[PDB]
Amino acid sequence: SELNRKLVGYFPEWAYSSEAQGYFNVTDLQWDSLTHIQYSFAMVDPSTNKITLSNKHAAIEEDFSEFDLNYNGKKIELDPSLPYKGHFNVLQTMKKNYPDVSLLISVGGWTGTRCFYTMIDTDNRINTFADSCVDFIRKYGFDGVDIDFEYPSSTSQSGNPDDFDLSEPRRTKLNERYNILIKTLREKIDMASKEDGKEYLLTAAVTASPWVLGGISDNTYAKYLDFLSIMSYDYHGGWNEYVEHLAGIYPNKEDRETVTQIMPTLCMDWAYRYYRGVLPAEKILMGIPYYTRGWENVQGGINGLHGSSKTPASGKYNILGDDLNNDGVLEPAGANPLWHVLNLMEQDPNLKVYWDEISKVPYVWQNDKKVFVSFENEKSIDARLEYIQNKNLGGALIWVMNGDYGLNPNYVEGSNKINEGKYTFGDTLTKRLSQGLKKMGVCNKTPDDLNISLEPINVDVKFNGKYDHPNYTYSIDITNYTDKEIKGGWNVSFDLPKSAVFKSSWGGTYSVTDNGDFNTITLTSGAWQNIAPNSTITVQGMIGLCFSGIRNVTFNGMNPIGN
Ligand SMILES: Cn1cnc2c1c(=O)n(CCCn1c(=O)c3c(ncn3C)n(C)c1=O)c(=O)n2C
């Protein structure tokens, strides 16, 4: 069951009352196609350090009397035997007909990370928080917890700027404290599973940004997750001038933002390689967007792509723009659900779709207004399915379920109103993903690292280092716990994820051997580097770019098992 493909979708609790979000509610979820639903969002309470609802009314109070609850054709009523209403009642009611769809509570997000920073400060607060997550999933009938901390990184000025007053003083410890948080959550959730006779999950949606990842020194937390979802989107957008893809799959040497870097990093496949240092592919999900970002008055490029713009797209090209002063004026971002872009194309024959065969995503270009918007369509879904099969990925995580498309019951020919176009939300791309995940079958089990099958040696190999972008300076400490000197000329090897490039060994000699998602690095010492019994020797060198961890460490062709 753990090797089954996963199709996980985010449910936005705010959508049901919002025109731009299509008034999407729980009965509009793609229940026949999703395997898991992530409810967005819970957060951490500032005073109690417990999990808390963000919109309590939506989650547990709303009766939907002013909204339409129906699935397929059948009216859906709230279950009156439950002690809560809201989206959570509808979720439980639907799950009775879809008992194998797993429900996860997502905690955090871009605007819900703030109180994580203080909660992680002490072990007793982490314990209180983890206990409260167990209480919450029991109370509201959830199957697990998804942690969306943006971001547990030492990178200065990462995460939401509104939280710098909390994150900046904590940068040096955030990664260590996050690792304790995830481990403690796993411990408490596994105990609850045993007590309740139910298999609860713990997952995380994690950064794909090399800038953020340069400040992440320990990815051990990943081993405690049922799956790790890479947020392989938001690679590009109106925060800078580079008119480039939101969510490319493959590395693109023409991405102008990274054209001088060691390799192109702003694509799913780079993050896949990064995370292979700590996880097998079958525990990694691809992030897929059902939203866009974009620019207007684009200069240069070809059909906008690889051009430049200091003006993110606005107006009818930005219906999901943020309203930060709550005045109706939206911040330009070129942000739309997919169905709205389809409706714009129905109205404008000069808003045209193009395909990038390198990145394997589509984009939309208006050649008169010079508007470029990212896009996602059947062709990119098919390319993503091919990637999932080729890489043995666990599946996909979708932000966000009201952005898929289908035909609109409220269509009015000739109307420009947001919810009167040919299309509204639907299940077209999600069903296509589900069908493809069914067709390819279950994941394979990735074999264990080969080192554990080798003969053991009582040598400890400890890999550490420091990252100063783009350079990782490593230090390997080798301790001889045998009773005989180890002569110089010994070798150590390790597998380095292909998110990074080995550059130099500072002493001795080295070789680099292709090994799948890794390069095997073999460091051969000089004859003078003898290791006395109970002694430690250190070697250093440099690697370009970052990686989640190293694997498959060997020493003199044996498995170094320490003391
Ligand atoms: C964890 N995660 C994974 N992918 C994500 C996120 C995430 O937090 N956000 C940022 C989400 C911002 N947001 C909103 O847009 C939002 C909202 N309430 C009303 N809206 C309109 N909340 C509570 C919120 O947090 C994303 O945009 N994506 C792609």
Numbering used by the authors: 47 to 609
Paper text:
C. perfringens type G, the causative agent of necrotic enteritis in broilers, produces two glycosyl hydrolase family 18 chitinases, ChiA and ChiB, which display distinct substrate preferences. Whereas ChiB preferentially processes linear substrates such as chitin, ChiA prefers larger and more branched substrates, such as carbohydrates presented by the chicken intestinal mucus. Here, we show via crystal structures of ChiA and ChiB in the apo and ligand-bound forms that the two enzymes display structural features that explain their substrate preferences providing a structural blueprint for further interrogation of their function and inhibition. We succeeded in obtaining several crystal structures of recombinant ChiA and ChiB in apo (unbound) and ligand-bound forms to resolutions between 1.30 Å and 1.85 Å. Both ChiA and ChiB encode for an N-terminal glycosyl hydrolase family 18 (GH18) Trios-phosphate Isomerase (TIM) barrel followed by a C-terminal putative carbohydrate binding domain (CBD).
